Design a protein around this nucleic acid. Sequence first.
RNA 1: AUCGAGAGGC
Lengths: 86, 102, 114, 65, 133, 45, 196, 264, 559, 49, 160, 141
Amino acid sequence: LKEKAIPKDQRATTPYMTKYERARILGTRALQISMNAPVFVDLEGETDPLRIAMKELAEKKIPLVIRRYLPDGSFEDWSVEELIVD
Amino acid sequence: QNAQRDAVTLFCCLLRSRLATRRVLQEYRLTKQAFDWVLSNIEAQFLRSVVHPGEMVGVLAAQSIGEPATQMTLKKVTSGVPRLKEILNVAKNMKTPSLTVY
Amino acid sequence: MNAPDRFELFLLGEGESKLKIDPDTKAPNAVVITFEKEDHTLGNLIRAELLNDRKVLFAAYKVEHPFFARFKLRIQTTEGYDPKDALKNACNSIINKLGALKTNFETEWNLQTL
Amino acid sequence: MIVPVRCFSCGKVVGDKWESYLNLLQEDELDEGTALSRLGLKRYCCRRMILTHVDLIEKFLRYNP
Amino acid sequence: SNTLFDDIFQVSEVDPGRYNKVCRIEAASTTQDQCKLTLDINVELFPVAAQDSLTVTIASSLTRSWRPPQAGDRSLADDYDYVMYGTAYKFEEVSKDLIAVYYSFGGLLMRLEGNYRNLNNLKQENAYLLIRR
Amino acid sequence: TLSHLRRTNTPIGLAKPRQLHNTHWGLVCPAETPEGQACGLVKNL
Amino acid sequence: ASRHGQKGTIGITYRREDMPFTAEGIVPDLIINPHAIPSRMTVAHLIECLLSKVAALSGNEGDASPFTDITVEGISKLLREHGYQSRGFEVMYNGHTGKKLMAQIFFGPTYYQRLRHMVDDKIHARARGPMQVLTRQPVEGRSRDGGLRFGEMERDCMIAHGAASFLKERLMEASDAFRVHICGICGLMTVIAKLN
Amino acid sequence: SEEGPQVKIREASKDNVDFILSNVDLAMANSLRRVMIAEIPTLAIDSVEVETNTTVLADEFIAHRLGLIPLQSMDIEQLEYSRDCFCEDHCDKCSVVLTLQAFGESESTTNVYSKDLVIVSNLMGRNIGHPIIQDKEGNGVLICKLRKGQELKLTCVAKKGIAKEHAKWGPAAAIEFEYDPWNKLKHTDYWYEQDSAKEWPQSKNCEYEDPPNEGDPFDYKAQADTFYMNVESVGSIPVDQVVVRGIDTLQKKVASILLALTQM
Amino acid sequence: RGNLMGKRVDFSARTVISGDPNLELDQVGVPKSIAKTLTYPEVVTPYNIDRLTQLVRNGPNEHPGAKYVIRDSGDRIDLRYSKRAGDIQLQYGWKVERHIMDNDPVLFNRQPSLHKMSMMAHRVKVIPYSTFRLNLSVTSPYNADFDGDEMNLHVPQSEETRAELSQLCAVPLQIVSPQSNKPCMGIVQDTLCGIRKLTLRDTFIELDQVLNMLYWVPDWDGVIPTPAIIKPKPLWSGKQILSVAIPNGIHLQRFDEGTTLLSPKDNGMLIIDGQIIFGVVEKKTVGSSNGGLIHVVTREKGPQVCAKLFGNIQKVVNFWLLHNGFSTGIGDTIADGPTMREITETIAEAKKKVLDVTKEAQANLLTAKHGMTLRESFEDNVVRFLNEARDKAGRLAEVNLKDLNNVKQMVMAGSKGSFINIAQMSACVGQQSVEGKRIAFGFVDRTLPHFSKDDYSPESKGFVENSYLRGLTPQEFFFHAMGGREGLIDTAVKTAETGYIQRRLVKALEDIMVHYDNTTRNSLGNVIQFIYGEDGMDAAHIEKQSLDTIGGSDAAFEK
Amino acid sequence: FDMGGYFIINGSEKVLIAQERSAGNIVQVFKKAAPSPISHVAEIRSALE
Amino acid sequence: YDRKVPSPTGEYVKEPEWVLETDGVNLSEVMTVPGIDPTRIYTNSFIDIMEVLGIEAGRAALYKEVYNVIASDGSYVNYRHMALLVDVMTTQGGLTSVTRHGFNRSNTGALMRCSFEETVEILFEAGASAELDDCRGVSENVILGQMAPIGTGAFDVMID
Amino acid sequence: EGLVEYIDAEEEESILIAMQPEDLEPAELDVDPAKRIRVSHHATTFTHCEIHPSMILGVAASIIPFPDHNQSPRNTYQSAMGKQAMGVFLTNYNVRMDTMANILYYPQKPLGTTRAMEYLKFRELPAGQNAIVAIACYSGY
RNA sequence: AUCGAGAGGC
Ligand SMILES: [Mg+2]
Ligand SMILES: [Zn+2]
Ligand SMILES: [Zn+2]
Ligand SMILES: [Zn+2]
């Protein structure tokens, strides 16, 4: 409806990055980097866009935010920074 | 919170049976640091072992059932594919209706 | 349709060096020689001859794929012993035994009638 | 459809032995084992080239064109 | 880096099992009628007959990549007839002041029981077995 | 070529027809028949 | 294939020096895996190697007709009369090393058939080939340089994996993508659109 | 005689040689037979130019049959690989040209043997390119058969090569190869039903080595250094030259390694 | 269902398959033709322009090449037919349709696509010949076989698509399948038979072979392990040398029947920190088995290490095998005269039991046990008798099988073969059956026109006392064929019925997805489960472990 | 070695495949289903030769 | 049946018991018979159990029957998959089969329905009832060539 | 001369066929153990005898050597595959112009032959070759 | 294009 937002304090979705959202994120970054877009890491002799994005993730230099949608229509925004990878 | 206590109820039973105070010290011989490492590993493997949202588990289940039936091969009761088709297609006129009485 | 020309089994092409030499990692005094356009005819003989030089520590070879005629021979020798020299000695000893074989065979054959 | 040159397996030339073989069975009334033995074909890899051969060319010649 | 066990055993039962070059030998200590052992022996290399008397020894030495004996320069730590290398995998408390040690030489097993070796045998990768004639 | 000239069809369409029958002895080859679909309906003399 | 439903393709071509060899110098034209034997119970194949061996040595024929009193024991007796091991085994040396094979090998003539299914007649590869007319999808068949079908059985698999983008890619960019114009009132592509 | 490997010839013939190798490690004998098969060079047809073919066979059939024909290759060392010669396609120092032309004149069936191959190119005085004929009647291999009224006119260009490139280039006739008849080495595990002795036949070579004693233990440090070989040649090269040239080819192959080592 | 739910697609390839022992698990042997034919759009960047220029220069006719160039304007540049195919000046922001090259991710498929494990991403390895090549341990999910099978390949065309293939659909990720909560790939038929013989206590390896085995392992430490035997001759054990393939830091613990810690029969398995202590390696240890080596390595070390372990163990065992040798032959189907005598004695004693029960029925002396007729009782007794006879002769044979018998070896390693196979090939093939009963009276009151009417004998209704080795009689042959036809039909029918059933299941549950709140819902959001699997776990990483509270006396519980 | 028994229609050689059918003008009796109103049936396919 | 039961010591031991197997089913009447355990009687005609013991008992009977058919061939499948199937058949009022008669007449959009069976008839019914498809289903998005709400597309991504 | 009769399916319902003429010999012990086990006929009212039981097979199965030693589905499969094997389908192949024709270079007659082959003309128009087959594990390709 | 038949894997 109108502004079905959620306060960041009251969030119960999994703080861990699901394998699906990780693959989507890495794909979108490797796409951005396939085109001549800026890289936010010191590429230590790396050329593959996917390896670049994968190493941009470990240093958490990927400024994207997931919008986890709930069935009622509500949603939770989660920055890549606060998300966990394991 | 009740749903959570219910969803883990079985695991915690194994947990307590395995980390019993006399067990940790007589069967295992855990030091303090080894014990805290056991705790960390269990929590980590658990939190990894949770199902990842977005999983299309319906198709996964349907395949997980259909494929082992493709190898379903050849003492009075219908079994195998005939019985399975009796089950899915709700079969009012079953071939072998039986009743087991205790 | 997809088969490679059979002369690729013995004819080097486009700067394919006969021998490439690489220093091994996690192994002191160890080196791996990529032989090109060779097969079990050569590598087995080189290894069995290296296994006779008492100052040789590690001697083995492998053909990573029968599709291709090439193989790897890894040698590890004693302190103060460049493995290339052990390879040289092995090759030369092989050649000496082979010449001896040829002379002895010629002797026995010319001795033979019919 | 014609006598192979050499045995597939070992490579011994056998194509020079067809007609001789056919005479060894016909003129001398030998048997196949001894006819093959006489021609120096001692290993069976070689023998199965002559024993199992069907010289179909004799049928192909009959076609006049 | 010295010896960790020494005794003399007389053989009781040799059993080839389903094997062709290995036999399971069962023996006990001599002049000591309480401590026994079981071992797997390559009979092809060093034969083993019943009622023989075999001098058994265990050493901690004499990590690094094995190299063949270059020449007689390497001074052997053994004038024996049979030598193996294994790894301790179990120390079984048989009873009060009665212990058992379990060794495996790449599959060939060893079980030794008794309690006059407590101070020496250890949960250490290093274990050299030695049998004399 | 020989096999094609001794082949029977059975167009009725179900395993009772498809099975090798006792009376088939001496008249139809027992084993020679196509596999998968239309197995046992198409037989050879 | 042999004469006993032992169908099979070639995985490798080994030259004769690389082939295991017997003391007579003989070499297999063919090498088949033992693991194809016991699950099919095609014992006639095994008997055929034996009989064909005895025939090639004897210069006689193999009476492999059915319902006979030919026994494996008589064949082995003949074969031993001809100086080979009774059951068909043979000492074989490795081709690369020359050191003997610990296992002696089952080795002998066997009738094999070359079938009509050959690779280069079945190989197919398409990258943006011709499309069909009605559907604007790739045409069917390799004789028309067509595209493989991405059936629903495979759509289901892609769904199970979770790959949504690859699924859309296979289903839109790779087959029959298209762009249409629609009216925001009547949601039907009856819109007249001049781009120029 | 000379320190190292020892050869004792048991039987010698124009066609095969049965002999014994002593004081040789295995891998050398193995690589020797491998080179004897694959890497020894000879001469055989590697191009066929057909003009008229009225036979019941296709052209490629006949071309294949021709390539398989044994040709004299004694002086082959004086011939060069056409890939190395500087000619346009082939020359007189890199190729030998045969010609073949036969016609079905007689009402009877006309045979086409290898003796009907005619050496057209200049031999320059070397024993090269003459078809090998071991037939008692003098004909060659039966290349083809012709009905009255069929002819065949073609030209074969024979070049140098080794059996690795194609098996037609080999003295590749089977090579017998045995060591340790009694299996004193314990190098194979014998399969048996009741008795490994009575079920396995003894080798002819069981005579040239003395039997082991059932009481003797397993000689563990012994290695195999005594081999029994029988090398047979098709005829393109005499047997003695087959084994000598194999030895020399192997030694030459090792030499290139030293040359590359010096180049490094 | 033919143009929307499925459709023919570009960038598709298809050919025969065959196995390569020298390919890593996730690799796939792509013929050079297909690699030249399939393209990937790569946008030019400062990191790749040097490589893309060389590719364009090398042209589409040879690999690694490229076929098309896309400018910023949007016009296609065909490298096969263009004057300017030589003097190309790639500009940033252009697209090069390069060739498929090594280590690209491709989706690999085999029909029928029943599994998520039937469509798995693979690493491209371009190989010369015309066949697709894959590691044997990837057959079990595909149910592949190298007898003329064909497999399909699909090429991603976007970066995120490559990402989804590599990070979700990759082969090493699907090693543990959610279905059956166990690994779906393991060691197979040659490596499996070999590894046993290698790991026999009786298997000893000398120096020369040992060093080659050491080198053959790719990620090898370069440390020669100390030989197990030293004094009379430096010797290694198969266990010892194989343990180099096993990564350090792994513990595997399994006890078979009668398995003392001394393990006199060398059964069970004890692997301590990347080295094995005792136990003959076989299917239970290294198969696609719950709680096996693959489960342990995949969970502890990870997917990639498990994949590399596949390759390492394959290379080692295959090398040993190739130089050791293994053949089957006919000799492994012969039981000695005494055993065959006992077997035919067993068959005759069963025939006599049948005769006696038959005459008992002929005198109206049956005990009409409740619920079933006299004829049913009679038929069940005879069928029981004959099956007991078949299994008794089979076990009689299997007892006589020597430990060198190659059929027995394949059975022991679990590579191929079963008890029934041995029994039929050597002892007795048994009783045939159609629609459940014995061979019916197709004629009037008889089975074949060589039998008098009303003959319920063992052989009159399809008992084949002869073994496949001994040879069947004409009647036995006909009855055997009569029975096997029913099996051909059962397969040809259950195949279609199961395809329909599978499709129905899939189409009924297609929309069921674990939403973000762990509710299991559908397109409408109607709740199916409130916690997936009633516990909210992924079906993978779930292992069978015992609950020690249950069971045992309250006394032992207290103690 | 040709065996005959085929036709040559528009160049292509054609074979007529034997069509199987239960013979007519013979009487057979068939039981009926358990829920059938009638118990048994005797049928004959009367066909003029 | 050689069933297992706790010994008074606490250890489990096998206590064989006599059990009756019928060749027919009328559960309602047999349940009310003396001499039996009306808490343990069991039928493979699970639909009768749905009629008598409620739908929730039918769920367990369904799962037990499927478990038997799968484990008969020595196979094994994890609990969750069969459970999902059974719940989907059950989550409605009673028993919904995997057939054109069952789930495919639900309210599960309209395009998802026409992708299984009775395609054009379902389309017509949708034309009549003025149906509106949510376009959140899988097959709906596939038919439309859009990224379906699957694991990768179960969400959106935006800028930090 | 009334020594052979034509018997259809219906008529054979009323007769007793012997399998071998040796079934008609009178009977009045020490046997080869390797031979298959043949039951005594236990019947005497014979009216016929099969010409030879191997005549129950087709044109394809009469190619299979020792089909009485094979699990029946294998005997079926080979019948289905022998129709895909290459060879000389006709001696006039060089004259006919067929849409497709595959012909083996050097066909060989099998070393193991059925008695039926003589009438199927297989030894005159073979379809495969006597390949030296080794059953072995060797590099696992 | 439409339709038919035959064949390949499970
Ligand atoms: Mg297949
Ligand atoms: Zn030969
Ligand atoms: Zn409008
Ligand atoms: Zn020249």
